[PDB]
């Protein structure tokens, strides 16, 4: 899941 | 390229959120691209404290290809804002 967004990162709401 | 047309944007927070949402990505080149883009948007977001902070953060790291872009974005804001230049 999200290979580049990092597991501990603020999630994009929309 | 199309910088003159930037000022005529009615919806700014949504756009800036979309652009800024890729500064937390772990990819050192994806951070460098986004810092350049922010630097290219000083005209329409010259007072954003979160952008100022993120640039001042990326300015002191270990990845050359992102430090060389944070420098550019910092030079870009330092012209269209004051409280950023002082820091």
């Amino acid at each position: 899941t999200s290979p580049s967004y990092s597991p501990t990162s603020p999630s994009y709401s929309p | 390229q199309s910088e003159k047309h930037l000022e005529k944007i009615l919806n700014v927070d949504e756009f800036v959120k979309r652009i800024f949402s890729v500064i937390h990505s772990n990819d050192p080149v994806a951070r460098a691209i986004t810092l350049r883009m922010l630097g290219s948007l000083a005209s329409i977001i010259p007072e954003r404290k979160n952008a100022h902070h993120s640039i001042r953060q990326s300015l002191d790291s270990h990845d050359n290809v992102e430090v060389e872009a944070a420098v550019f974005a910092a030079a870009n804001f330092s012209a269209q804002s004051k409280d950023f230049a002082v820091g």
């Binding site: 990162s9 603020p10 | 937390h24 979160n50 902070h53």
Partner: protein, 300 residues
């Protein structure tokens, strides 16, 4: 006792002015104050305004006799559960005399370091007066006498009012009161925090004052909040908590409290989690009139 109007109206002024000169009759100022008290229930409404204002202006009086104005109660019933001139003046015909009463009470409460604790309940209860002017005056007087006062159980009642329709003046006044009040119990700070969060989530327009009141509420008494540090910001002992959003004006609200408290207590950056350091740098860069400079290693 002249049994005609426009006479007593100034006879009261005369008795006050002569009395304040020197208290030597047998007790002279106390006697004059007793006379004013027995008069406060004058038939008219014009007299009572002077009655209240003049006794308010007076400053020196026998302690033991002073409380006899307030002595009558459901208030002491509530206190146990957890564990007369003004009594009538506070509830009168039209709001003018109520305003005069609250002003007199604030003046003489300031004068006497004691007698304040006796009047906190009489103030707080009189919030739902239905006259916005009396509302504002009550908030202002509570602020002005807020010093060396405790709200062991009054916290919840004085905070329930924080939810007004808009009453922008009232809610701002309540924030002003909170930033200058004093609490002693940790659960009190926790409670105030939770009601403030409800306030912010329901009226997302005065966050700019919520933050300042929280700043002062932290700086005023830091040690009270230290036990809350693990609980208020999620710090699951062996799980890496997901970065809470940087700009959320509830997370910023709860962070400004901690940072302001952190000026005093040196031990607590140990409690600070991973994110809080870069978040502190971001805050100290954005809102420089809310978070003071600290000793954190990240920003030396």
């Amino acid at each position: 006792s002249d049994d005609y109007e426009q006479v007593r109206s100034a006879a009261v002024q005369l008795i006050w002015v002569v009395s304040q000169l020197y208290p030597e009759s047998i007790r002279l100022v106390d006697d004059a104050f007793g006379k004013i008290c027995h008069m406060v229930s004058d038939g008219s409404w014009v007299v009572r305004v002077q009655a209240a204002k003049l006794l308010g202006s007076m400053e020196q009086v026998s302690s033991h006799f002073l409380e006899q104005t307030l002595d009558k109660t459901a208030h002491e019933r509530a206190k146990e559960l957890y564990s007369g001139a003004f009594v009538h003046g506070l509830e009168d015909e039209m709001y003018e005399v109520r305003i005069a009463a609250v002003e007199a009470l604030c003046m003489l409460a300031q004068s006497s370091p004691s007698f304040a604790e006796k009047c906190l309940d009489f103030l707080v209860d009189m919030f739902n007066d239905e006259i916005e002017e009396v509302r504002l005056q009550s908030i202002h007087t509570m602020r002005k006498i807020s010093n060396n006062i405790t709200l062991r159980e009054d916290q919840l009642d004085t905070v329930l009012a924080v939810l007004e329709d808009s009453s922008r003046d009232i809610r701002e006044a309540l924030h002003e009161l909170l930033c200058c009040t004093n609490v002693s119990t940790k659960e009190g700070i926790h409670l105030a925090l939770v009601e403030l969060l409800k306030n912010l989530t329901k009226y997302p327009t005065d966050r700019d004052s919520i933050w300042k009141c929280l700043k002062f509420l932290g700086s005023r008494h830091p040690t009270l909040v230290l036990p809350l540090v693990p609980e208020l910001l999620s710090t699951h002992p062996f799980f890496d908590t997901a970065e809470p959003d940087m700009d959320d004006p509830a997370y910023i609200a709860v962070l400004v409290l901690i940072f302001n408290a952190a000026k005093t207590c040196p031990t607590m950056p140990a409690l600070f989690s991973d994110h809080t350091f870069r978040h502190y740098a971001y805050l100290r860069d954005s809102l420089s009139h809310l978070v003071p400079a600290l000793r954190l290693p990240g920003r030396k």
